[PDB]
Amino acid sequence: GPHMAQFATTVLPPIPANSFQLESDFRQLKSSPDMLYQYLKQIEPSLYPKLFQKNLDPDVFNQIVKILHDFYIEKEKPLLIFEILQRLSELKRFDMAVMFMSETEKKIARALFNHIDKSGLKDSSVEELKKRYGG
């Protein structure tokens, strides 16, 4: 409504050991995207291929993208969004996560590559990774 609701008292959880632990912390914070940004800030791109090595989740795939869209574009560097999206593209389930996305998640995914491009970042991987997520 026109006012802010009462939110529960919560604190950014530690960095997870594997995807089972990551998706648990994503699905509990999905309604708190402003702390999801700060939870993402703990996680380095070197953990992305290792957490998700046995599988990804389609809801985690769209949540990573959905937090990059409204926070890493404003608060972090355009290069960081691009590196995060690249780590996920090497996952064995990533294209099944794209298959479970709708137009509403794909318009967010391209809006990342649209901001990265206009920020001055030009590589063949920019236009490849945009088509892998929503071309």
Dihedral over alpha carbons 35, 37, 135, 45 (to 10 degrees): -130
Q: Return d(Cα 104, Cα 110) in angstroms, integer.
A: 11
**Method used experimentally:** NMR
First to last CA, the chain: 35
Helix, strand, coil content of the chain in percent (nearest 5): 65, 0, 35
Q: Return d(Cα 74, Cα 96) in angstroms, integer.
A: 29
Copy the structure tokens of residue 78. Answer: 């355009």
CA proximity to 81, closest of 67, 95, 96 = 67
